[PDB]
Amino acid sequence: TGTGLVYVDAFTRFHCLWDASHPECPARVSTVMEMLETEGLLGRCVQVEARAVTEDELLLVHTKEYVELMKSTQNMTEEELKTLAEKYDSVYLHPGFFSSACLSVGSVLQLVDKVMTSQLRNGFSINRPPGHHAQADKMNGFCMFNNLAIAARYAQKRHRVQRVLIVDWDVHHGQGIQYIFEEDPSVLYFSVHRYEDGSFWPHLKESDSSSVGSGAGQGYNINLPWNKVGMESGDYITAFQQLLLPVAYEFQPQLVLVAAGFDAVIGDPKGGMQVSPECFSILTHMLKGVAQGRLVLALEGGYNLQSTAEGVCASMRSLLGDPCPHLPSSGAPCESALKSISKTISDLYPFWKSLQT
């Protein structure tokens, strides 16, 4: 009936012990909640309780060996925690990380419950730590557990969902989600991300559009890599209109999960793109036409506190049914974006009839 929102103060209870200016910080989520309140959007949402993920739920994606190790991080010193975090690419540790990460996963599962049982139309978790880089047996890129990968498998097991679409519009490639479902045709992963032929983190050849999945999963992994900076709303709108939504309607998902990072929004200190926050109202609107609008967004990256809050608010207005905004930018894509879109289409053409033109 309404739009669910999950936030708990526990999401603020971890931070970089050795860098007080680390970009992945408590203020990210507090600033979002502050703007949701001042814009009058928070009071229009249905408040949904978070919950801690269970061991069995984590096992849906992560190895028992890795779960046990992360759980032990709550008993380590600033030096020990530093010893384990140096074993991973671009992470920090903190005694409260595991606890918050479990509530971060659980917040998404709460919304999947309510959306799949028709208690709510859709929902947004305002969660950290992020998830889309976490992998079966390792932390990565500020992530401990892969929130949306867990949620997808949870939906299939607990709610009899056959097909899940995961849309990842964070400026970084969610390689963790890609890996978990690489061979799986029941979970379609779409990621649009800065790539620049691998010079942009996470620096992986697998982030290119030639990675279409493997085995039975061929055609169910779709990468849209940007190879120039400064992409705009028109480029994302074009990518969604001519690539993602055609495949989405052909796939017929029963649930859509969004890796809703906002480091592609104008103003992010490191993402390098020029996407207006209003664009995400349109992108969210398009995704509501699919899966009877069964749509759950979960926060990933985005490090300009205002830009990220504005992106969340824009997405939230569309979840709540408010009229789409006026787009300040051109509705015409640039050549680099069209070349990227054309190349991905060429890589995916053989598996999707809706792309055959």
Ligand X SMILES: CC(/C=C/C(=O)NO)=C\[C@@H](C)C(=O)c1ccc(N(C)C)cc1
Residues in contact with ligand X by the rule CB under 6 A? 90, 141-142, 170, 172, 201, 261, 263, 270, 300-301
Residue 193 binds K ion, judged by CB under 5 A: yes
Of the pair 221, 233, the CB lying nearest K ion is at: 221
Of the pair 113, 170, the CB lying nearest K ion is at: 170
Q: In the complex, what is the shortest distance from the CB of residue 251 to K ion, in angstroms, rounded to a whole number?
A: 11
The secondary element (H helix, E strand) that includes residue 273 is: none
Residue 129 binds Zn ion, judged by CB under 5 A: no
Residue 220 binds K ion, judged by CB under 5 A: yes
Give the CA radius of gyration of the chain. Answer: 19
Which of these, 195, 173, 201, lies nearest to 336 by C-alpha position?
195
Which of these, 296, 306, 300, lies nearest to 267 by C-alpha position?
306
Q: In the complex, what is the shortest distance from the CB of residue 171 to ligand X, in angstroms, rounded to a whole number?
A: 7
Which residue's C-beta sits nearest to ligand X?
301
Of the pair 124, 142, the CB lying nearest ligand X is at: 142
The reply to whether 263 sits in an annotated binding site is yes
133 is an active site residue? yes
Residue 193 binds Zn ion, judged by CB under 5 A: no
279, 179 Cβ separation under 8 angstroms: no
Of the pair 232, 300, the CB lying nearest ligand X is at: 300
Catalytic-role residue among 94, 133, 173, 285:
133
Rounded distance, CA 114 to CA 250, Å?
25
Q: In the complex, what is the shortest distance from the CB of residue 143 to ligand X, in angstroms, rounded to a whole number?
A: 8
Choosing from 14, 154, 181, 236, the residue that interacts with K ion (CB under 5 A) is: 181
Residue 191 binds K ion, judged by CB under 5 A: yes
Within the chain, residue ranges assigned H as helices are: 27-38, 55-59, 64-71, 78-85, 97-116, 147-159, 175-180, 233-239, 245-251, 279-287, 305-319, 335-348
Q: In the complex, what is the shortest distance from the CB of residue 128 to ligand X, in angstroms, rounded to a whole number?
A: 11
By CB under 5 A, the residues from 125 to 164 that bind K ion are: none
Of the pair 110, 127, the CB lying nearest Zn ion is at: 127
Rounded distance, CA 338 to CA 68, Å?
45
Token reading at 272: 């390098």
With tokens 């640039």, the residue in question is 334
Q: In the complex, what is the shortest distance from the CB of residue 18 to ligand X, in angstroms, rounded to a whole number?
A: 9
Using CB under 5 A, which of the segments 138-146, 155-163, 184-192, 307-315 binds K ion?
Answer: 184-192
Which of these, 262, 62, 73, lies nearest to 149 by C-alpha position?
62
- Neighbouring C-beta atoms of residue 342, cutoff 10 Å: 13
Residue 301 binds Zn ion, judged by CB under 5 A: yes
Which of these, 196, 233, 188, 197, lies nearest to 329 by C-alpha position?
233
What lies within 8 Å, CB to CB, of 213 at 6+ separation is 181, 182, 183, 184, 185, 219, 220, 221
Contacts with Zn ion, residue ranges (CB under 5 A): 170, 172, 261, 263, 301
Give the annotated binding-site residues: 170, 172, 263
Give the annotated binding-site residues for Zn(2+): 170, 172, 263
Contacts with K ion, residue ranges (CB under 5 A): 168, 170, 181, 184, 189, 191, 193, 217, 220-221
Catalytic positions are 133
